[PDB]
């Protein structure tokens, strides 16, 4: 993090207490939990310098996820630089050709920046910072989606002893965290409620005097009329 | 069937040979096979009188499907009569109120028609005949879809000894003959190819150097690179 | 949360630290514990924008409870809008017909609000905010009461090894969290103390020289004269 | 099928009796038998409209072979359209640029053709029809060769109880329906007769006072001098 003061942009590091809490969050909840992504968005609020994001991912991520994240961050930054050479009005670019932003300046590899966060904060633009930050966030999302797969939705059955809300949670999780289009999730969730969800609940849904046309309505109906046991 | 000659509309019955062949087709292939529906469409080519369709369904259908079909035919004819009272320009209706078509005239129950196909062919309109015929076809479709369910798609697995084309046929049949929207069948078929289809073919599809984005392409790829055994 | 400043209503997000603590509270204590409802009331203190409440319930609730909560919130907001069209003096409404509040404006679906919390905070009324907040709280209460049933009170027995205060806690919980009228809980709790609560305590309550006419008095008496073991 | 009459090209459907017989032929004999290909050539005699061929393949082929056939038909039609843009003298094309034939017109997807066979027969050219028909025939051949592989020729042995004419039939089938060049089939068939075909017939062929230089001559010799049993 940088503070743009009168003397110039002064760099302030992130608290190691927040970083330790975020690292333990990633350690217990995993990379893909919505609470973890919310915490990352929180610590991704102010535009960070390449040094900050690099050290942050070095600390919170293990070695192999860190390698994957470096790869993904490079790819996303390259897409950004292609869009930048496709539009001279990038908030990282300038009007003349002398302000064109090279990947050495984005990854912090340019002259006067390697290993020095103060000089980094000096030469970098705010548009550069926000582009780097958005790129790093998208790369984190990619790596998180890659490190742990969503479980195959079509293999999910309600166990003989499992409750129905746990089964519904697991199924909705695996269906929404999958490769289906957004407009195909609700019908699939409904038809999986009807064919999975062991034959007692199957018959309970089948003999519904009303027509249930939404996963929430099916869940409410089943929770009302379920066999207390 | 009727022939509209100079003396007047003369009724000609359908051949009992064609009816016997159609009955045996329904007996061996079932009610829902595409060949059976094609044969029914064939014998549903000329506009039939209520007597013809009623006797045809009496002969080709069993007792319980015949009861179901009578119910469905009545419901569809009632929808037709509601649309007819909602539009005085029905090809079964006339311009004045004296030509309004009652359900007794559609079901063949009106005066001068009960049990007599000749009088039926005399008083009926061609628009009446085509409306009755379309109603009977839709009712047959409903009863055929009702008598035998499509198998639940989410419970289909490729057996240890089953070939892949049989599994693909069964899966595509159960997915297309189900309650899914038309725009959700291809993604579901693909994701069921990937998660069902026992782990040898699962790994064969997983390690595809190209991206397969269509059930036909997946089928072609698997048929090319399958383990001959 | 919004701050109504001189430039205009500026939106401030809730702390992810408080949200993480509340999510872990819901994870360990459940949805129905009085501590959880107190914490929700705490984080429901300032009038929240639809964006805030929606994201809050997305984070703290699982997928299936979140679907149930969306349903219940919609129903409660519809009741609010019916009361609003039944009274033109709603703090969300205005005096003329041009200020009537549609459900698109309450759920945050209206024009200039979809996905943008700043514009949301701009166009929304404080009465709108408090109505949305009360609706969301009532919906949370409904879903919490629905997700986990109170245990059937008439099936509660004091175990052979269970202490009496645990049995009394369980019984009072199940009786007060049930479908009985408020004026029928004390007599039922007393008569369940007398007939459940294995025969040693049954005889201890039976041979009470004084008449015990309150669950608290029965609990005090039994705790005084109980067989220390 | 279309009849080009004085009023204009009138469409006549194929008989459902012939289609049912062809479907049962495909069901019993398979896709690759020479009798099946002859029957398809028979029903592929008059130039068919895209509607006719599409419905024909929908009826005679299962779901997965139908998907494969749609793919192959599209590819072959694309090759045809490439040849058409490579030669302005295509019987489907015209002399000016306004008669160039797009794939929407070949697949029946163009304007005034979607779902309507009468309009289809109206706007289509006879060269268009014959090109579509030849493309569909080649696609059927590809899919038939793909759905069922020829058995590996180099793994064919004459069983201990199998007769010699059955072994010769199986071997010639697998060798001619394989990936060998046409000029390499006879020597391979001969050398497989000599090394397979269990040692009694091996010695019978070895001790041939004449030199046998053709599979037919070897078959005749073995049938003459075989051990009757």
Numbering used by the authors:
A (entry chain A), B (entry chain A), C (entry chain A), D (entry chain A): 1 to 229
Sentences from the paper on this structure:
As the virus buds from the cell, the viral protease cleaves Gag into several fragments, including the capsid protein (CA) that then assembles into the mature capsid shell (core), rendering the virus particle infectious. The CA portion of all retroviral Gag proteins folds into two separate domains, the N-terminal domain (CANTD) and C-terminal domain (CACTD). In mature lattices, CANTD interactions form only intra-hexamer and intra-pentamer interfaces, while CACTD interactions are also involved in formation of inter-hexamer and inter-pentamer interfaces. Our results show that, like lentiviruses, RSV is sensitive to IP6 in vitro and in cells, where in the mature CA lattice IP6 binds in a pore formed in the center of the CANTD hexamer.
High concentrations of NaPO4 are known to induce RSV CA to assemble predominantly into T = 1 icosahedral CLPs, which consist of only 12 pentamers. The observation that within pleomorphic polyhedrons the CA pentamer constitutes the rigid building block prompted us to investigate if the pentamers within T = 1 icosahedrons and polyhedrons are structurally identical. Hence, we acquired cryo-EM micrographs of T = 1 icosahedral CLPs and subjected them to single-particle analysis, yielding a 3.1 Å resolution reconstruction. At this resolution refinement of RSV CA into the EM density was unambiguously possible. We compared the model of T = 1 pentamers with the model of the pentamer derived from the polyhedrons. In fact, the two models are virtually superimposable, showing an RMSD of their C-alpha atoms of 0.74 Å. This finding further underscores the observations that the RSV CA pentamer (1) is very rigid due to the tighter packing of the CA domains in the pentamer, (2) always promotes the same local geometry, and (3) is independent in arrangement of the size and shape of the CLP. In contrast, the increased flexibility of the RSV hexamer allows a more random distribution of pentamers in mature RSV cores. This enables RSV CA to even form inter-pentameric contacts, which can be regularly observed on polyhedrons and in particular T = 1 icosahedral particles.
